[PDB]
Amino acid sequence: ERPSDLVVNRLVLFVVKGTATSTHNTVKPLILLEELGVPHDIYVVEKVSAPWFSEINPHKMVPAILDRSPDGRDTLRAWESTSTLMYIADAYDKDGTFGGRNVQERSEINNWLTLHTAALGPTAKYWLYFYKLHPEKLPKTIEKLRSNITVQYDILERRLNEPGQQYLALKDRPTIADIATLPFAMKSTAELFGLEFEKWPKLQEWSVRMGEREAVKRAWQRVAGFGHGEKEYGMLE
Amino acid sequence: SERPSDLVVNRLVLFVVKGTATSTHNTVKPLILLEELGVPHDIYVVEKVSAPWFSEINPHKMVPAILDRSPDGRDTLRAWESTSTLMYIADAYDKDGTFGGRNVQERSEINNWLTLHTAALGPTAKYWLYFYKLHPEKLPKTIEKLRSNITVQYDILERRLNEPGQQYLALKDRPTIADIATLPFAMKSTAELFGLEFEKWPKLQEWSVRMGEREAVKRAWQRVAGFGHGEKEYGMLE
Numbered sequence: 001e002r003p004s005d006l007v008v009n010r011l012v013l014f015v016v017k018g019t020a021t022s023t024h025n026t027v028k029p030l031i032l033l034e035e036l037g038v039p040h041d042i043y044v045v046e047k048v049s050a051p052w053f054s055e056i057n058p059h060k061m062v063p064a065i066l067d068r069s070p071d072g073r074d075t076l077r078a079w080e081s082t083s084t085l086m087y088i089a090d091a092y093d094k095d096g097t098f099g100g101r102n103v104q105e106r107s108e109i110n111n112w113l114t115l116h117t118a119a120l121g122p123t124a125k126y127w128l129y130f131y132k133l134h135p136e137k138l139p140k141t142i143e144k145l146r147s148n149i150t151v152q153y154d155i156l157e158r159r160l161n162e163p164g165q166q167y168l169a170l171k172d173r174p175t176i177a178d179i180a181t182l183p184f185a186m187k188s189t190a191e192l193f194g195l196e197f198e199k200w201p202k203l204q205e206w207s208v209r210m211g212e213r214e215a216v217k218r219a220w221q222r223v224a225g226f227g228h229g230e231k232e233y234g235m236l237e
Numbered sequence: 238s239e240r241p242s243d244l245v246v247n248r249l250v251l252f253v254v255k256g257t258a259t260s261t262h263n264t265v266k267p268l269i270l271l272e273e274l275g276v277p278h279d280i281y282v283v284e285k286v287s288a289p290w291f292s293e294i295n296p297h298k299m300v301p302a303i304l305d306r307s308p309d310g311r312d313t314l315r316a317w318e319s320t321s322t323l324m325y326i327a328d329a330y331d332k333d334g335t336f337g338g339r340n341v342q343e344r345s346e347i348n349n350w351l352t353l354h355t356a357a358l359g360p361t362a363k364y365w366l367y368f369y370k371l372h373p374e375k376l377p378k379t380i381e382k383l384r385s386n387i388t389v390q391y392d393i394l395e396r397r398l399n400e401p402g403q404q405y406l407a408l409k410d411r412p413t414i415a416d417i418a419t420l421p422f423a424m425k426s427t428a429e430l431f432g433l434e435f436e437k438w439p440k441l442q443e444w445s446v447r448m449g450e451r452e453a454v455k456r457a458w459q460r461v462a463g464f465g466h467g468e469k470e471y472g473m474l475e
Binding site for chain 2: 058059069070074076077078079080082083086087090091102103104106107108110111113114115117118119121122123126130134136138140141144155158159
């Protein structure tokens, strides 16, 4: 049984209370919602271990989405941060502004998106797990994962040194590939990993360019604030 | 970084390496989809993924990778990361959405189960194999934690395949790119490599056998084993 306040009248984005450590994945769908002006609700989950929540996301993490299907016959769900980006682009990005408008654009968007999904994302997750969460400190494992993060920064730096390559996938504009990558490739995150972000100058310039976008600024403000307003948990007003 | 003499793109080219038990579990994924759809393609056996010419195709320096003609045939495009190669082949060659999804509802579930593989079991299995075989020092505590994380992913797949009428991971009715992406890391032979008893996940095991019985899947496993062991060892196969 769902909490009485969980109703799906529009896209519902599931988050947790905003902290330094709780927002690097939930901000991704929120950036795209803000870029496209998608109507949406925010649901602050007190416990991702709650049985009702595992019915939405069997991986028991945020972000997750519930939404009405286009014809209204079904409740759709999206989970895994990359999947939430794919879902929002499919349902709401009519012109392929962030998803890609042709096979050529989508080929590069999916390359750079999937590189984040399979390489930097899981490597960063494992680094954080062994650094902070694992009951025993395994420094040789932590060092290897940190090394692998620098290799991923090297790949992104190479790409952003290519002539006219202002964004990761497309030369001309940011895509879901850039949105997926940004939270794991910005100065604050590099510093958490014990790295000097200045050692990847084109990647740092790209992170600042992304950070100056009004939708990205709004997304970071909102994700920090969730659960700290008039309502702590549940459907926000 | 000059391309080898024998690298031409007249149709889809799939980049692979010499076939072994542990070199084919990602390259087999696009090959299954190419076999399912009957997409004309060439096979290119890469001797060294560290070669500069190859990093101009895939900056991550791994197989699988694809070069193909653009839809209008005036340009060449690339796909790399096994999940990206599946998304590309579905975009360019699955116009009916038989494997990619026919509508927003179907694609929502396909992308959930495909991304779960891309983010969780895929990278966890890659790190398991890295620390087990490739890392110069054995780190058994790390290897054990990664093995434990594989069982947690098997538990999620098992839960899904116990849902009423849920014969495949994404859709009830037919296999999709989510099923193709998952299969090589969720079959008895791979479970045994990980030191797991695959019988502990009965609906997952039954699903792996149902996928394995498909003619396209049999053809893909058959071919991927043989690449680099024929009359031509490296380069464009005939």
